[PDB]
Amino acid sequence: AQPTASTVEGLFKPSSAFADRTDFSLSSILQKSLINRESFNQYLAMRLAPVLRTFYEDNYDTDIKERLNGFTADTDNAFVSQEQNLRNQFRENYLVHLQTDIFDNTGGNQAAWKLRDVNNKIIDDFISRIFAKNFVEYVQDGVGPLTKPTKSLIENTSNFKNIKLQPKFVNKNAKLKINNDAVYAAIQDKLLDQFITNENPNLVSRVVFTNETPVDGFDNYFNTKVIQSPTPSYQFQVFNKYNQQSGGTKGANGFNLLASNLKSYKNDQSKGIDIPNKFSSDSGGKLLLKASDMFDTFDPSFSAAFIQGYLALQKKSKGADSKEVDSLIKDKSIIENFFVDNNTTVHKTDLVKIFGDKDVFAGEYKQQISKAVVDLIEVKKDSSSQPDYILSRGKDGIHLMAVDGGSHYLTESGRDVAKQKKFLLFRALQTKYGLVDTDTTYDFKLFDEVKKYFDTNRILFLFEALLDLSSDTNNKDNFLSYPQFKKFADSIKSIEKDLKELVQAHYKQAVFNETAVAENKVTLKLAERNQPFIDNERNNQIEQNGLAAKLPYEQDAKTGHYNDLGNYYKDIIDNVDKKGNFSEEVVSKLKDNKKKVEEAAKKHVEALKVFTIPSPLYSQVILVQTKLSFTPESTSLGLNLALNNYLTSTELQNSIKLSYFQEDEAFKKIIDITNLTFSQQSGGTGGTNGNNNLTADNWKIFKETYLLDLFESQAQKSIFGHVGIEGVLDTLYSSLNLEERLDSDDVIDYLSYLYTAHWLLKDNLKNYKQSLQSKLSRTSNAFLVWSVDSEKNKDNNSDITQTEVKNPNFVFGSSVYDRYGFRGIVTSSTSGSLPEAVSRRLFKQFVNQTNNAYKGALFSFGSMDNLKNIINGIQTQTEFDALYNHLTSDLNIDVTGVDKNKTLTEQKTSLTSFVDSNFKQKDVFSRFDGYIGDNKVEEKNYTSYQFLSDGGKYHATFVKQVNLDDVEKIGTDSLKQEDSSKDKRLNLSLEEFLAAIALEALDPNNQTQAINALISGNKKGLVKVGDFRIFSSISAQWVRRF
């Protein structure tokens, strides 16, 4: 089957270089690919599974020996099937697509496919068999591990040292068929420790008393006249009071059976805390609150309360009240514990002051709630002791939680990961032999949890575990010293000097990435939980809150981060740092490790001596190769796979777009693209001369406008802190880690906006003039509007349009507890951002029926003869219809003698005659620069301005008039700092003009035009690409084939 010539001519032609820039060379593209997490893991698979091939090779078991032969046979059969189906599908040109859509993604060779699928099969099998057995044991000396250790033997802190995750019949000095378990128990105890290290997986024994529908009746608690038809939930939380007659063990009865003897559920020998299942409404028991999905799989009020207990052990918990076990309110309902004293810290929801002079509660709630209200309190055995039990109410009722072993492996110095691993191994041993108490059930499988967390990094984590295994030369009891695994442990030894410098950094940064991702969920989900209690206050439904209480956790005004809740993850990044506020520490140690990955990847690619192999027949990729590696073929294919992932990735596309910015010398004079810092600092480097004459602060306002446009699109706007907005904006900017991520969408969009802002600023605003001309019109007034919403209407003459509206629409939380308004040049056709009230007052009700009220109405024409030159310019009937309606229904100018029945000539003739005979010079053509509301006044006379009124709300609006008589007048002298040149920029100041230009730059049409200018205005032309994976990845608007 000779392939047809059409596809052969039409297929991509591989070249010597991937692209034609100084950052797209082999030594740079391979380094960047090895820094890409997904690409790096695709490489590590091919550099890690050759290590695990040796274990299958020297293994005693006949089955494991035959696994390699079976994998090769299955690979041959799969190749036969692939060839058969490709032939039956493509016929004439099947070989071309066999090399194109299969081999290129695989390594570019027939044997490349077999070295991919076999090398993945063996690593998958080795991954499965690590966790195929349970090895948590209490090891006795001279008889081996006891088949069933006794309860009193293992439930001791001093006896934790004997729970070491060791196999049963493994002898170092013997060739045992099942000696391979000595491998897994060594790797598992490594992987498990990673699980103990990164996830910080504390166990919590918790009891939840679900929300109770009150048989007493909600009217007793929450009156219907204010709260109609309550439903059992957090906001209306009620439990039937404790009665001794009914023989119940849940609700207040369960809380009485529980809190009376609360001190007796901590097994002080084991330091663990075990609370009975029957005392909880659900199945009850213990849950694993690891760092990753504890704010995902469970309620935020639950996970955050567990964190509060976590730091309560470590004397780091803040904001919560403390009361002893004996002080618990068990006779009354449970909620009475939370009505804490108000007289004079602890963050208490004083609902008496919150609801003001409105009756929201009734009966016992009204009498109690005076007395503040909280959500979480700390209950402890003794006044001198530290809080071991935490009581908090969430979505599904009130939970009493206690971390078990917290006094053991969590102290003021931080988390003790060795003790934590020992304690969780003790719990896993408890579950292994059914040695738990009869009144509790262990829904706790540590091996399943470590397997599920480790399976995310199925390649990096296993490789790092092996490296740390071979990094411990002082421990002679590992499987490395077993003569059965002498060469296998040598294979792990042949990968330290080569890759470990890179893999340690990659692991230490990926774990930090996951830790930052998980700790972002803290401030994300706490805000999500607090969202309805802000919605209620927004909708004037504050009374719906009822029993809603603010959590004790403090937030950062300057950062928008929960510091104490971040300590739970700081106790992770302080552990992965030693391997080999949390916000500041992680932001420092992510860049200090990203530079380490840069260095390690560059050294690894250097030491590999990478050269480009010529591509095979019908190939469309630029493959690479190496020879300075322990297994040259697998390392070459690993680099091939890492490249196949990076070239198709959006990181390389954003790198190409980054290079297009690199080329533009005009833009690079004002920015430092790699540094993402505005250039020229502050001085005379190019200052002052034409061609975008402005400072570097003059670009900070463009950046701030971009940040505000991004902030307005945020799903939640309180995850970034609060007061004003100049701080929240830089916090949002930091949150993007743009300088740490130069090959992201978040940076190409930022730079696209920045060159949109410059492409309106260059050539003496040659494109800003065009945008304004195509936006403005002569028959419609245009304004620069500073419109603020005043919920209250009016020397006590402070301007309210220049006073910052902190927390507008309650966007930075709630106020009661814990020159602005600019819209740019807004016209009638584009008045979406303006409120309908002010937009109608400007572009449809300029001169209301209630003098200077006509000033600026026909300023859209600017001069006397201008509207005369436009009225006779009408050719058709509808053209005059629009003008007449605008002059009457919009510009409210009285018309005399006009007739609809007139012909085309007389139609315009009557209007021209009446315009001339009515305006034979009321400052109608003057420029209106002042306040518009219920009345109209100038800027100077703010003492006589009536705010616009609409639907009970008020608006304060400043408008500066803009016509085409100043759109054309912006030119070379438009960016000068001088005040006398303000007429050269729409009679604006420089800052106002640049803010308007930035708002114009946010236009998608402006950005598209400026980006096409960037690509077309390239000194070297469009970037060429020699690899198809770089051509298909990014659109032809940026890259061209050779």
Curated annotation (Swiss-Prot):
The keyword Cell membrane applies. Pfam families: DUF3713. It is found in: Cell membrane. It comes from the Bacteria. PROSITE patterns: PROKAR_LIPOPROTEIN. It is a lipid-anchor. This is Uncharacterized lipoprotein MG309 homolog. It comes from Mycoplasma pneumoniae (strain ATCC 29342 / M129 / Subtype 1).
